Design a protein around this nucleic acid. Structure first.
Ligand code: ZN
Ligand code: ZN
Lengths: 499, 76, 77, 114, 81, 510, 74, 83, 311, 106
RNA sequence: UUACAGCUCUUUUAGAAUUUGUCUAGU
RNA sequence: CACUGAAUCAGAUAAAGAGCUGUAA
């Protein structure tokens, strides 16, 4: 009746398996349910057992990453959930193929699977789509999503339950991109901000200085006759890297002979989403759609497998997976690591325990998938393309809104705690702004009080310091107090008379 | 035909002694190939069989007619 | 597997050289992507020079070494 | 050992007897050619189309003239005999190579390499 | 006037309807010619002949065969007699 | 008690344009300004004196009947105010005006609005989305703006003005309740009982056939003409309803068992490539059936594999000789829809399929009703001299098979009248349509409505003081809601009889 | 009514055939089974070289690319 | 895409080449068009038979599988693809 | 460009396409010579039927659909296109024979009606009908075929064979699409070539093959529920065999095959309820309400759903 | 641990290598040549020359292929070089099936 | 509730038969 | 330190299955 409980069932002091229960005035909203990409089996789910799925009203999925939408076919189908779920239009068209790839990679793993693809396709009919900036209402909950950046189709779900306005940002970026826009500062100031804390107090190299260091790296590999391997994820930053290299070769006539490839069957199936949803781009592409689609490439083709192309002369092939576990981005490496002319460009990120993190220490000799040991002599360059916010972009985002209560999710415990320590000492000097930052872990609820005056309206015959008597209607939270006569004028049901 | 297991790029621009099915021996600068062993050999030699030598030049050799390739020497 | 470009030889008088020293002439009427020819008014030129009208034939394309043109055939650039 | 980096080229091998003579890469064999020439060297990286890239051969012409070479590359169609060595046990070196392809085709996952 | 082309699978199939005696010339075998009547043909030009006979050009012998199945790899021409 | 008044500047008694001026308490919403087909100046002089008492121009459906005057009202008349329109009104309504200028610039010296006025009117426009509540900031403070889907053209809107309170002033013109192929229908249930509804009566007396019944007679007319070796001219829009027929045709030209693909679709606009290129970018603006077939099978539904698009008469002649061309303009007044009419109306083996019912002073209204043959009509050319335009008149002897097949997406009179009856608007006006059909809608909403509906049929340059008193004052419940039971919106869940004192903003004490 | 070559061999299994190879070799015997490439398994096979008996072989499995014609003999 | 030597053969369309077939005949002449499967249309042919003679022809068309090797012109060795 | 030069260009094009994408070009040749200009069908008939000897299986299935659409446009062409339809019925593929049984379903009623409109017949037309009736009797023998799909389409052929070869009555309920199709009442008995008494026993000998096919123990599931609907079509359209269909319904209801599982036994039990409910409205079924209403109780049908459909 | 059982209360192909294609081909001539693998029948393979016959290999059969490629072990090859019969013994051989003529059985 | 076309998927099997991936020239 | 990937061979093999969309009853 009075309290608001934000209970992180996932991504509380960790990265992955995001889930947030939002309980306020009888309505429960579960925000952005995903799996943990570093666990196995049923352990990768959020702590869904701390609630019952039969009384969750909304389900707002921010974007299409597996730590944000991955546990969803388990939840919409294999549980007792009967509420309404919402995505953006560009999230759902990548969701169906991003997760069709998930149950193909989790098929060659242990057979304690969460769901299958026939359970994925029958989840597509239960998912409704919110467009950007549009106010949808479910059980008295207005909610409207902003452009979050960071991927094509992400969303910052503003939520308004009885005048309490909350913002879940998901994973957002605030730098202008080749195909994305910055995270929108709303014109409506929220009372509660639930924000990512992915980096804390780190910093980025500047965007004009990364794309120059990237294009000089690709160009120096193909000038020495070498092959360019760019291991990257299929969907996150592969599409942005492509815009850079295609533009860079319109500006250079001598590089037209050699070719640029992208080698993924997931980026093939999801390239049509980048060609269609141009309204979820930034203003730079949707004014360049007047001439031609920039995701219909002029010098970049798909590579189905490495049997198809002859390895004659220089080439730039950006294959997937990004951290080079297996697949085509690993066999293109093993075919190219025994030559000094070739060069690998680690454009994405790495995790301790993968081949893309082991290569950065420059080992003298790497291990083939078949157990053979090949001498690593190709050049290794690490050029970050984060698509997140550092401290100078998170603190600028939080000065512009000034929320009274800030809840940190989606960050590891050492980098989330350094972000809370920096946000407290940034607002402990000035007196007119007061921010109460929280970093709750899993299952730890955040109790917030939002007592507000209840306002009604007389507009019927009672509308003309006297007494007020009559029947009162509460729609969801909006009150109206009316005459006994005015139930056939305003209210759907006019009267009740028995004899 | 040739797949990528037999690295034909090892001997590119070398001097390759190519023996044909009829018995003729081509010795020329190995310029380019494909997935059918179409050999572009440059500044060729034609050794029939006592044995006579002919200067050919730029010979495209159809890969049906190739028996054995061996290295005559380094790139001149 | 692209078909042959033998449309320039349609309704032209060919002079085929098959394998084994066998040599036929006549007028082409059609083909296929296996280069199997149909030769109307086909004349068998034997080894002794004796000509033999053999009607119209189906010649399997596996055994066609060379086909010259006894009439003028269009050329490209 | 070493397998191909091509799914097109390792599945022709996995479905055929070629995976036999890829199991004896490194052993000195004798490859009798189709035109009755003899090549006797060390097999290195025979592909899915039996293009044998021998290492150090006492290559014999079909007229009998031995010209000792230091690399030789046999075309797949110009093969008739691959004299495999004595200590091979055919059905085991096939099952070893099928084990090597089976660990390249699956090969683990994420967070488990190091 | 452009005529529709006579494809080779038409004219073999034309011999099948007509029940017409053909005389096959052989691939790299000049002396012998099989001479039969097509009862059926295949995707790969495998001819099922009938009352077939080997026609040796030097022996001038006509060895009666009967209901044979000539394979497609051996045909170099299909004369109609 | 807001002073809500609207003046019909044009668009009533079958002057089939639209331009309205709905005042809300000294905030002059200019609803939906548009020219007619032949550019009369009876709206331009009616908008000279209202171009400075103006703010928040609310557009609608992308076509020159709803946004045609806007390049002239901005480039010449000089209105500097917000123009609220959704994204397909922005991108297809810009596409109509590039095919309204250039379709007359190929025939005559057309200098009413230039293309620099199309760009100027379509840059100072705020792209919205459906159900995007836009709170106005300025001299209209309590007014919020909400476009809702209408379903006539792509991104076609009804609006929902909401004053601070519940004064709900929905403007729903030319809507469509049915779910067609590339659009889903209009809702009109998120709005429940408004304070004013501004609806049309253009089809209030029209008995519309079934959509399945008139897809057959299109296919019968298209096939029988082509089997008889003859071309088909189809007069459609350039971006609005051409997307319905090019999706209606191409799913028939794909999914019939016969070899239909020998008969050469075309699509003649001056800007036709950008029509299909933008419609394959607004897939989130289209029908749910048409959207689900993209999110599950990665085929863009406007990736046509039979529509051979053409930009002019030079590009049209390089297709095979029987062809089905859907023309630029729905009236046969300008563009290639007139040029292809004159070239093959003299040949009996050709068909001419008019799909949209235009303004009554047009050549395409002359062919829908009163079918005559030996008639006189002007011919506008432009010869090479640098060029110069030629005007000449001819007698053409129409002997092709002219047929009107109704492919305008609008509701019929049993559903444009059922929705107003299923709603309960406390005030109604009836704002365009003939006087024969406005009375047929007025004498059912007054009849099968309540005692307090008060429908209107305003004439031209007639204002209507449609402001009704339901005085509203905002009382906040002070102490207790505990002794009551607080029932809900769905049904009689509880009962919430409440008495109380006031304290004069005021409160409620027991 | 036409009789295609795949129904021809399937109606000839178990019967005495006489497979003539491409270079005069000729093998009569009981055709046991054939496959899609028309490999010809023959049982009780005796070899006719130059039209004369050479020797009773036994069971003979002729590869596809050697057969000139198969002939139903009686 | 097709390989480099087929593209190198297409860059010799319009020059005098030498073609030797499987049967031993050597075909010296201007080649007009070559295909991806090495079907070579040629013109103004000087032939050299297996027994050894000289005849001169006008226009031929050689099956691509019946070509043993092609002698491209010595001008063409400075192609942009062979570098 | 002329249609008789567009068809030639589309046949030079369809003769060089190797894969199964030639039928997009080749169905365009169909629509130009049977719909746009039907006078060219006599000219290009010998070049479309040449594609029935094709390597692909959908090209020779085009020829089966082409002969169906050319004999319904010109039935005089059946004198040539019936020698080319049995060798598509004797084809070794099994999707090709299933299409050849669909075409013989429509082109038997039309072939028989063409034989009786001709008051005088020719000896070349005599060679056509005894070749249609020979291949109509071979589809009866394809009830013993080892494919599930050949048996399914042959059941739908013999229901088009029994109804065609058995006469109408006053209570023969025939739908509006099957109205002008031939029956055995509008046959001539003084006809020169075809005989009434031959086709009289031919219609019931094809019934006996359909009946003993259903009491077979190893009958498949979808072959059964197609045969149940085929006995219901030869009862409502032919009330002469009303005493025989109900005897075959109760034999199957007392003796279900044990080979099909319970998830498809209940699909047989559901669809048998639908056809006995639909045969009850027919006025020749009032004689046998002691058998139909007895069987519907065992299927689990209440009395209200039986008493609502009584005419 | 225990949490997986709290989440399960809210719930309201074969390999195709070369050796698995060995026991197939049973209704074909190749699958009868698989009985020589099982029963251990001495297999004497005829080997083609360029045109005709070259020799007979006569070895126990191990592990054949689709292409008639096969690995004979106890080989005693009697061949003819282009009449001088030279027989030589091979302890394990690989014969590719392009060169085989007909598989005689003993 | 049946039958045909249109695209997206699942097991079984093919991917050894005419211009290069399993030989009538190796003269 | 930011969250998964060419499913055991060719851009078209063949049987048996599936689901959606449309149109014919
Ligand atoms: Zn993310
Ligand atoms: Zn995340």
């Amino acid at each position: 009746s009075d309290q608001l409980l934000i209970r992180p069932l996932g991504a509380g002091q960790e990265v992955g398996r995001s889930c947030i229960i939002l309980e306020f005035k009888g309505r429960k909203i579960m925000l952005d349910c995903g799996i943990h990409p570093g666990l196995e089996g049923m352990d990768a789910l959020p702590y869904i057992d701390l609630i019952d799925p039969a009384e969750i009203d909304l389900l707002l999925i921010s974007h299409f990453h597996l730590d944000h939408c991955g546990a969803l076919p388990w939840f919409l189908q294999k549980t007792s959930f009967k509420g309404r779920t919402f995505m953006t239009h560009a999230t759902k068209a990548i969701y169906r193929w991003l997760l069709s790839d998930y149950v193909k990679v989790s098929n060659i793993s242990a057979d304690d699977m969460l769901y299958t693809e026939t359970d994925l396709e029958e989840s597509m009919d239960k998912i409704e789509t919110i467009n950007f900036h549009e106010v949808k209402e479910v059980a008295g909950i207005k909610f409207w999503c902003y452009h979050a950046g960071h991927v094509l189709g992400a969303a910052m779900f503003m939520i308004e339950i009885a005048g309490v306005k909350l913002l879940y940002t998901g994973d957002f970026s605030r730098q202008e991109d080749r195909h994305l826009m910055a995270a929108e500062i709303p014109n409506i100031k929220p009372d509660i901000l639930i924000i990512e804390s992915t980096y804390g107090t780190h910093i980025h190299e500047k965007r004009e200085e990364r794309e120059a260091r990237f294009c000089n790296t690709v160009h120096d590999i193909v000038n020495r006759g070498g092959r360019g391997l760019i291991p990257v994820f299929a969907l996150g930053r592969a599409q942005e890297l492509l815009l850079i290299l295609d533009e860079y070769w319109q500006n250079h006539p001598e590089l037209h002979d050699i070719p640029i490839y992208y080698a993924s069957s997931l980026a093939k199936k999801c390239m049509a989403v980048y060609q269609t949803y141009v309204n979820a781009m930034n203003d730079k592409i949707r004014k360049q759609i007047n001439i031609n689609n920039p995701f219909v490439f002029k010098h970049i083709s798909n590579l189905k497998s490495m049997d198809h192309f002859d390895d004659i002369g220089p080439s730039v092939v950006m294959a997937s997976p990004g951290m080079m576990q297996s697949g085509l981005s690993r066999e293109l490496f093993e075919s190219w690591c025994t030559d000094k002319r070739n060069g690998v460009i680690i454009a994405g990120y790495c995790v301790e325990g993968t081949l893309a993190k082991h290569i950065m220490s420059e080992p003298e000799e790497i291990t083939t998938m078949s157990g053979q040991k090949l001498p690593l002599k190709m050049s290794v360059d690490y050029i970050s393309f984060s698509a997140h916010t550092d401290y100078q972009q998170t603190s600028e985002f939080i000065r512009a809104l000034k929320p009274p209560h800030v809840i940190l999710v989606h960050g590891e415990q050492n980098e989330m705690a350094r972000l809370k320590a920096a946000l407290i000492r940034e607002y402990e000097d000035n007196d007119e702004v007061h921010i109460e930052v929280h970093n709750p872990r899993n299952t730890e609820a955040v109790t917030l009080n939002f007592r507000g005056e209840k306002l009604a309206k007389v507009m019927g015959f009672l509308a003309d310091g006297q007494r007020v008597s009559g029947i009162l209607v509460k729609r969801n939270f909006n009150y109206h107090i009316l005459s006994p006569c005015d139930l056939s004028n305003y209210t759907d049901l006019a009267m009740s008379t028995v004899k | 035909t040739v797949g990528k297991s037999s690295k034909m790029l090892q001997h590119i621009d070398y001097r390759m002694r190519c023996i044909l099915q009829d018995g003729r021996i081509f010795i020329g600068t190995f310029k380019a190939f494909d997935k059918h062993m179409n050999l572009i050999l440059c500044d060729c030699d034609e050794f029939r069989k006592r044995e006579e030598k002919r200067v050919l030049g730029l010979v495209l050799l159809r890969g049906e007619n190739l028996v054995s390739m061996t290295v005559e020497g380094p790139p001149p | 597997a692209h078909p042959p470009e033998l449309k320039k030889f349609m309704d032209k008088k060919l002079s085929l050289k098959l394998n084994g020293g066998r040599h036929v002439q006549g007028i082409l009427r059609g083909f296929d992507p296996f280069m199997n020819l149909v030769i109307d008014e086909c004349v068998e030129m034997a080894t002794s020079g004796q000509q033999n009208n053999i009607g119209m034939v189906v010649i399997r394309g596996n055994s066609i070494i060379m086909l010259e043109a006894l009439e003028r055939v269009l050329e490209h650039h | 050992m070493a397998v191909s980096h091509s799914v097109k080229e390792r599945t022709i091998s996995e479905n055929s007897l070629i995976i036999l003579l890829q199991g004896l890469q490194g052993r000195v064999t004798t490859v009798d050619l189709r035109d009755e020439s003899v090549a006797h060297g060390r097999i290195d990286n025979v592909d899915a189309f039996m293009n044998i890239r021998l290492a150090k051969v006492t290559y014999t012409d079909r007229w009998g003239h031995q010209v000792k070479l230091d690399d030789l590359f046999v075309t797949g169609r110009n093969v008739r005999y691959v004299h495999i060595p004595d200590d091979v046990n055919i059905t085991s070196t096939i099952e070893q190579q099928l084990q090597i392809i089976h660990r390249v085709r699956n090969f683990g996952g994420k967070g488990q390499g190091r | 006037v452009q005529k529709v082309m006579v494809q080779p699978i038409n004219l073999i199939f034309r011999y099948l309807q007509n029940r017409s005696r053909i005389q096959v010339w052989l691939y790299e075998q000049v002396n012998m010619r099989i001479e039969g009547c097509i009862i059926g043909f295949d995707e790969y030009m495998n001819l099922v002949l009938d009352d077939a006979e080997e026609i040796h050009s030097k022996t001038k012998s006509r060895k009666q065969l009967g209901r044979i199945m000539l394979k497609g790899d051996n045909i170099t021409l299909l004369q109609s007699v | 008690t807001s002073i809500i008044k609207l003046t019909t500047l044009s668009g009533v008694q079958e002057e089939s344009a639209l331009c309205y001026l709905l005042q809300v308490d000294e905030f002059r919403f200019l609803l939906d300004c548009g020219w007619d087909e032949h550019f009369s100046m009876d709206i331009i002089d009616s908008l000279r004196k209202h171009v400075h008492q103006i703010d928040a121009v609310l557009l609608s459906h992308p076509d020159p009947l709803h946004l045609g005057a806007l390049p002239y009202a901005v480039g010449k008349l000089g209105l500097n105010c917000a123009i609220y329109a959704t994204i397909p009104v922005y991108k297809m309504g810009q596409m109509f005006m590039y095919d309204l200028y250039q379709s007359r610039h190929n025939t005559e010296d057309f200098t009413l609005f230039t293309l620099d006025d199309v760009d100027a009117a379509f840059d100072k426009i705020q792209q919205l989305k459906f159900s995007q509540i836009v709170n106005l900031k300025g001299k209209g403070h309590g007014l919020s703006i909400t476009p809702l889907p209408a379903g006539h053209m792509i991104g076609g809107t009804i609006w929902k003005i909401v004053k601070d309170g519940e004064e709900e002033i929905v403007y729903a013109v030319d809507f469509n309740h049915k779910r067609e192929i590339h659009l889903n229908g209009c809702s009109l249930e998120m709005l429940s009982r408004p304070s004013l509804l501004i609806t049309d009566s253009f089809n209030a007396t029209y008995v519309q056939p079934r959509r399945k019944q008139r897809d057959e007679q299109l296919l019968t007319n298209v096939l029988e003409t082509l089997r008889g070796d003859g071309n088909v001219l189809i007069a459609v829009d350039t971006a609005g309803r051409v997307l319905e027929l090019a999706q209606l045709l191409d799913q028939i030209w794909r999914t019939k068992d016969a070899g239909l693909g020998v008969y050469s679709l075309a699509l003649l606009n001056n800007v036709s490539y950008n029509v299909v290129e933008f419609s394959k970018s607004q897939v989130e603006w289209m029908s749910d059936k048409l959207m689900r077939c993209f999110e599950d099978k990665r085929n863009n539904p406007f990736q046509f594999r039979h529509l051979s698009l053409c930009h002019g008469l030079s590009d049209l002649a390089r297709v095979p000789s029987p062809k089905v061309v859907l023309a630029s303009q729905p009236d046969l007044e300008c563009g290639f829809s007139r040029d292809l009419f004159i070239q093959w109306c003299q040949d009996p083996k050709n068909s001419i399929i008019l799909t949209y019912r235009t303004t009554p002073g047009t050549l395409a209204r002359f062919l829908i009703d009163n079918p005559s043959e030996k008639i006189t009509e002007i011919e506008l050319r432009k010869r090479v001299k640098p060029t110069k335009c030629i005007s000449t008149t001819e007698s053409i002897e129409i002997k092709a098979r002219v047929t009107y097949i109704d492919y305008e997406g609008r509701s019929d009179g049993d559903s444009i009248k059922k929705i107003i009856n299923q709603m309960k608007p406390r005030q109604l006006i009836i704002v365009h349509g003939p006087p024969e059909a406005s009375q047929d809608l007025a004498e059912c909403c007054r009849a099968f409505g309540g005692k307090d509906i008060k429908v209107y049929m305003p004439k031209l340059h007639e204002t209507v003081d449609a402001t009704s008193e339901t005085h509203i004052y905002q009382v906040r419940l002070k102490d207790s809601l505990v002794s009551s039971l607080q029932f809900c919106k769905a049904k009689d869940a509880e009962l919430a009889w409440i008495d109380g004192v006031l304290d004069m903003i005021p409160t409620l004490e027991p | 009514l036409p009789l295609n070559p795949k129904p021809f061999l399937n109606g000839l299994t178990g019967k005495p055939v006489m497979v003539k190879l491409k270079w005069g070799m000729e093998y009569k015997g009981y055709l046991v089974s054939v496959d899609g490439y028309m490999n010809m398994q023959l049982a009780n096979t005796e070899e006719y070289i130059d039209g004369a008996l050479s020797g009773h072989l036994g069971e003979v499995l002729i590869r596809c690319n050697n057969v000139l014609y198969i002939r139903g003999v009686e | 895409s097709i390989g480099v030597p087929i593209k190198v053969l297409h860059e010799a369309e319009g020059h005098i080449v030498t073609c030797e077939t499987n049967t031993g005949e050597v075909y010296r002449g201007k080649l007009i068009e070559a295909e991806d499967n090495m079907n070579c249309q040629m013109s103004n042919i000087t032939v050299t038979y297996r027994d050894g003679r000289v005849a001169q022809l006008e226009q031929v068309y050689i099956r691509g599988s019946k070509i043993r090797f092609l002698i491209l012109p010595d001008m063409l060795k400075n192609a942009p693809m062979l570098k | 460009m002329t249609t008789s030069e567009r068809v030639v260009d589309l046949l030079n094009q369809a003769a060089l396409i190797t894969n199964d994408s030639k039928i997009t070009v080749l169905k365009q040749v169909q629509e130009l010579i049977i719909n746009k200009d039907p006078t060219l069908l006599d000219n290009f008939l010998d070049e479309i039927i040449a594609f029935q000897a094709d390597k692909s299986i959908e090209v020779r299935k085009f020829v089966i659909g082409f002969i169906e659409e050319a004999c319904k446009r010109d039935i005089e062409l059946l004198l040539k296109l019936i020698a080319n339809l049995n060798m598509l019925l004797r084809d070794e593929n099994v999707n090709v024979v299933k299409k050849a049984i669909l075409t013989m379903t429509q082109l038997y009623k039309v072939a028989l009606q063409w034989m009786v409109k001709s008051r005088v017949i020719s000896e070349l037309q005599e060679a056509c009908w005894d070749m249609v009736s020979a291949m109509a009797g071979d589809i009866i023998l394809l009830l013993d075929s080892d494919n599930d799909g050949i048996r399914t389409h042959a059941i739908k052929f013999v229901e088009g064979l029994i109804v065609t070869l058995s006469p109408r009555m006053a209570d023969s309920e025939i739908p509006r699409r099957q109205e002008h199709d031939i029956s055995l009442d509008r046959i001539p008995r003084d006809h020169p070539y075809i005989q009434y008494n031959v086709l009289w026993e031919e219609g019931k000998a094809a019934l006996e093959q359909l009946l003993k096919f259903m009491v077979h123990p190893a009958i498949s599931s979808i072959n059964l529920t197609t045969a149940l609907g085929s006995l219901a079509n030869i009862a409502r359209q032919r009330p002469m065999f009303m005493s025989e269909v109900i005897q075959a319904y109760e034999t199957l209801h007392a003796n279900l095959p044990p080979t099909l599982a319970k998830s498809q036994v209940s699909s047989v039990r559901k669809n048998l309820k639908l056809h006995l409910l639909s045969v009850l409205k027919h006025p020749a079924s009032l004689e046998f309400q002691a058998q139909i209403t007895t069987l519907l109780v065992d299927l689990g049908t209440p009395q209200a759903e039986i008493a609502r459909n009584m005419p | 641990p225990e949490r997986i059982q709290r989440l399960r209360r809210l719930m309201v192909k074969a390999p195709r290598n070369v050796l698995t294609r060995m026991p197939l081909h049973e209704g074909s001539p190749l699958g009868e040549l698989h009985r020589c693998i099982r029963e251990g029948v001495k297999v004497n393979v005829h080997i083609r020359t360029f045109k005709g016959l070259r020799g007979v290999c006569t070895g126990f059969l191990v592990a054949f292929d689709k292409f008639w490629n096969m690995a004979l072990t106890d080989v005693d090859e009697t061949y003819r070089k282009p009449q001088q019969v030279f027989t030589r013994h091979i302890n394990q051989i690989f014969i590719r099936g392009e060169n085989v003529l007909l598989v005689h059985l003993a």
